[PDB]
Amino acid sequence: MRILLCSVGTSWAVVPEAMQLLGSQGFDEVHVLTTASSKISPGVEQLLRYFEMHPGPRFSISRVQDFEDLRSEQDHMLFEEVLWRWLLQRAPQAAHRYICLAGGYKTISAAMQRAAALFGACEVFHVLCEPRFGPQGNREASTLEEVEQAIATNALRFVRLGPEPGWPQLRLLSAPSFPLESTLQGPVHWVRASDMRLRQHVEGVLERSRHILAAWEGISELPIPALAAWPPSHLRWLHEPLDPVQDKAWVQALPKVELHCHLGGFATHGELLHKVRQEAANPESLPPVRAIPLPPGWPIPEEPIGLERYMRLGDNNGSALLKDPGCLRAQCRLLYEALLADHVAYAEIRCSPANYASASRSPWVVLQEIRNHFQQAMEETPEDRRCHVNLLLTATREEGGDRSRIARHLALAITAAEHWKNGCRVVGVDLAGFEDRTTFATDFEPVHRVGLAVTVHAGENDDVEGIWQAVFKLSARRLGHALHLSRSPDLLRVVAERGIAVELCPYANLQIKGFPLDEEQEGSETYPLRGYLAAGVAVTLNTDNLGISQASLTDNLLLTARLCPGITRLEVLKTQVFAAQAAFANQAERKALWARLAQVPVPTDTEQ
């Protein structure tokens, strides 16, 4: 199969010479494109007369309706679009596309060359004939007789400029996505482009290709491979320090991962608390709303308040209030709404089913209700914006308290691990009672033996033996509030090399323990996020308690800018990638999460 595409200006004789590129074999098809100038119509007439003879191949003639003459650049873009659509239509494949640039304007010849370079062509050539067929033999061929004479006498020169392979993303473009409106007027078609779509599509493809090629060297240094298509200025902006106030919209639009969120600390005070109370199935059993004033300057107090006061700040919600089934349902639904409004894509929520169990509601019933409410909230949301929520069961140790709650939480987690295989799942346990009790560990071999994962939640104690025991005796895969890893360099090295994640909650850590804010240089009491990042630790930024901390995940990501002097937003993306890798997800959840993370928002402040 072999077709020929030509552009013709005032000289019509190029086409009869053009078919002689292959000699006697000729072309299987011939197609011609011209402009609307009246000076070509007689040439069209002679072309038709020539085409009457030699009826071997199938012939056609087109013309651009809107291109009378080249008056400005707008005519050039119009002709470019029409020529591109004509090339796609009349030449479905580039392996048998032959393009002749002889006729037309010099701009038209350049456009034909560029179209061949873009969409591909089998051969591109230019026809030359010596001037010995004309008035006194001083002109090139102009009528049929001398055209045939030149054909028979081999008086034509062909410069095969060579094949053009085209670009990979433009070589598979199809004709009917960008159609032409051909009007048959005799044996010649007349074509016109309705829209401009093809030019913007090609320009976008070329810009994306240039951006990918520019950033191709640093593929491994980008946390998300989809960032190579970013323009170099956008990547330079990505490598600048994060701004807490200017980058609010960019962080807000980011797809995030939440790995440390307590269910019972969500609607602890305010409008959310009243909304949860108003949904109670038994309003007469609701305890009265206690008076729990917030510390002045909340959520950023003048001085840290400690873990005890921070726990007591969330007493209007939790064990007391979530024993109501309606309150529990409203709590789960509102937590999912909060997660959706923050563009979270994957969430792990910490729950205590035995804390909300009653005489008629076993812990299994409470766990089933929580999981079913979350699954229902997930299935209602469209998949493009759906946040996948998994569950972690907290096993809190009490100082001198009962061991029964821990044992039944472990058994509940073991059973719910294989009870549910799709949607919302119980993915592990949160051993949050490891402080002042363990510097007695046999309780958790059944957890390991069934494939449940373990995260150990620190208790404000500054010792490093607890972290050691969590890593090596509890086989923990994540660490909560491990803010003193740097004090033991060997422990920090072990945590980095074993791929153990560290869950950091900026607002909770600032409120409970306190760190200097807006210090120009890193000091001895600086937040350990940047030091952990430099040490090779997979660091996650979380919320801990949405209600008590009075801050969202976007707010924590923005506060890391004030806690860590000169942290870059590339490191924010790194934290998100670390969170995605540290999640207790399976192959399908991980695939969906990676698909969601690739859609990083485009910056709008790349102007300096």
Tokens read off for 501? 């994640």
C-beta closer to ligand ATP: residue 32 or 370: 370
3-state secondary structure of 491: helix
- Interface of this chain with ligand ATP, residues 282 to 311, rule: CB under 6 A: 307, 311
* Bind-site residues: 260, 262, 264-265, 311, 314, 319, 352, 355-356, 396-397, 430, 435, 457, 544-545
Tokens read off for 210? 């240039």
355 binds, among Mg ion, ligand ATP, Zn ion, none (CB under 5 to 8 A by kind): ligand ATP
User: DSSP letters along 213-236, please?
Assistant: HHTSTTTTTSSSGGGGGS-HHHHH
User: What is the crossing angle of helices 106-119 and 73-90, to 10°?
Assistant: 40
- 319 near ligand ATP (CB under 6 A): yes
- 314 near Mg ion (CB under 5 A): yes
Contacts of 25 (CB under 8 A, 6+ apart): none
355, 455, 511, 550: which one contacts ligand ATP (CB under 6 A)?
355
**Integer Cα distance of 304 and 513 in angstroms:** 5
508, 559, 564, 582: which one contacts ligand ATP (CB under 6 A)?
508
C-beta closer to ligand ATP: residue 115 or 510: 510
Stretch in the footprint of a copy of itself (CB under 8 A) among 144-152, 219-227, 383-391, 479-487: 219-227
In which residue are the tokens 């990979």 written? 168
The least CB distance from residue 375 to ligand ATP, in Å, is 18
Q: Nearest 5°: phi and psi at 167? A: -95, 145
The least CB distance from residue 262 to Zn ion, in Å, is 6
38, 73, 293, 520: which one contacts a copy of itself (CB under 8 A)?
73
Stretch in the footprint of Mg ion (CB under 5 A) among 108-116, 175-183, 228-236, 317-325: 317-325
Length of the chain, in residues: 608
Binding mask 415-454 for ligand ATP (x = CB under 6 A): -----------------x----------------------
Pick from 310, 326, 312: nearest CA to 276? 326
**Beta strand spans in 163-321 (E):** 183-185, 188-190, 256-262
Pick from 553, 558, 546, 556: nearest CA to 270? 546
* Bind-site residues for Zn(2+): 260, 262, 430, 457, 544
Contacts of 36 (CB under 8 A, 6+ apart): 63, 64, 65, 66, 67, 68
The least CB distance from residue 101 to a copy of itself, in Å, is 6
- Interface of this chain with ligand ATP, residues 374 to 413, rule: CB under 6 A: 394, 396
Which element (helix H / strand E) includes 453? strand 453-457
The DSSP secondary-structure symbol of 349 reads E
- 506 near ligand ATP (CB under 6 A): no
The DSSP secondary-structure symbol of 116 reads H
11, 35, 252, 352: which one contacts ligand ATP (CB under 6 A)?
352
Q: How many residues bind ligand ATP (CB under 6 A)?
A: 22
169 binds, among Zn ion, a copy of itself, Mg ion, none (CB under 5 to 8 A by kind): a copy of itself
Decide if 209 contacts 169 (C-beta within 8 A): yes
**Integer Cα distance of 163 and 281 in angstroms:** 76
- 196 near a copy of itself (CB under 8 A): no
- 202 near ligand ATP (CB under 6 A): no
- 433 near Mg ion (CB under 5 A): no
**Integer Cα distance of 5 and 172 in angstroms:** 19
- 544 near ligand ATP (CB under 6 A): yes
- 536 near a copy of itself (CB under 8 A): yes
C-beta closer to ligand ATP: residue 116 or 395: 395
212, 253, 286, 294: which one contacts a copy of itself (CB under 8 A)?
212
* Bind-site residues for ATP: 262, 264-265, 311, 319, 352, 355-356, 396-397, 435, 457, 544-545
- Interface of this chain with a copy of itself, residues 579 to 608, rule: CB under 8 A: 587, 594
Tokens read off for 130? 């010596």
269, 329, 333, 477: which one contacts a copy of itself (CB under 8 A)?
477
- 521 near a copy of itself (CB under 8 A): no
Q: Can you list the alpha helix ranges (DSSP code H) found in 498-605?
A: 506-512, 529-534, 546-549, 553-563, 569-582, 587-597
The least CB distance from residue 417 to Mg ion, in Å, is 23
- 38 near a copy of itself (CB under 8 A): no
**Integer Cα distance of 121 and 96 in angstroms:** 7
**How crowded is the C-beta side of 356, counted as CA atoms within 13 Å?**
26
Residues 264, 270, 271, 274, Cα dihedral to 10° = 70
- 556 near ligand ATP (CB under 6 A): no
Stretch in the footprint of ligand ATP (CB under 6 A) among 115-123, 202-210, 351-359, 560-568: 351-359
The least CB distance from residue 540 to Zn ion, in Å, is 13
413 binds, among Mg ion, ligand ATP, a copy of itself, none (CB under 5 to 8 A by kind): none
Q: How many residues bind a copy of itself (CB under 8 A)?
A: 57
159 binds, among Zn ion, a copy of itself, ligand ATP, none (CB under 5 to 8 A by kind): a copy of itself
Q: Nearest 5°: phi and psi at 393? A: -95, 125
Decide if 310 contacts 508 (C-beta within 8 A): yes
CA–CA distances in Å: residue 445 to residues 431, 450, 453, 571: 13, 9, 11, 36
351 binds, among Zn ion, ligand ATP, Mg ion, none (CB under 5 to 8 A by kind): ligand ATP
- 172 near a copy of itself (CB under 8 A): no
- Interface of this chain with ligand ATP, residues 223 to 262, rule: CB under 6 A: 262
Pick from 411, 473, 416, 422: nearest CA to 447? 411
* Bind-site residues for Mg(2+): 262, 264, 314
126, 409, 425, 457: which one contacts ligand ATP (CB under 6 A)?
457
Q: State CA 444 to chain mean position distance.
A: 38
Residues of the chain with a following break (C to N over 2.5 Å) = 439
- Interface of this chain with a copy of itself, residues 409 to 448, rule: CB under 8 A: 445, 448
**Counting Cβ atoms within 10 Å, is residue 65 exposed (0-12), middle (13-18) or buried (19+)?**
middle
The least CB distance from residue 460 to Zn ion, in Å, is 11
Pick from 568, 482, 580: nearest CA to 532? 482
Q: Cis check for the bond before 299: say yes or no (omega within 30 of 0).
A: yes
- Interaction site with ligand ATP (CB under 6 A): 262-265, 307, 311, 314, 318-319, 322, 350-352, 355, 394, 396, 432, 457, 459, 508, 544-545
- Interaction site with Mg ion (CB under 5 A): 262, 264-265, 268, 314, 317-318
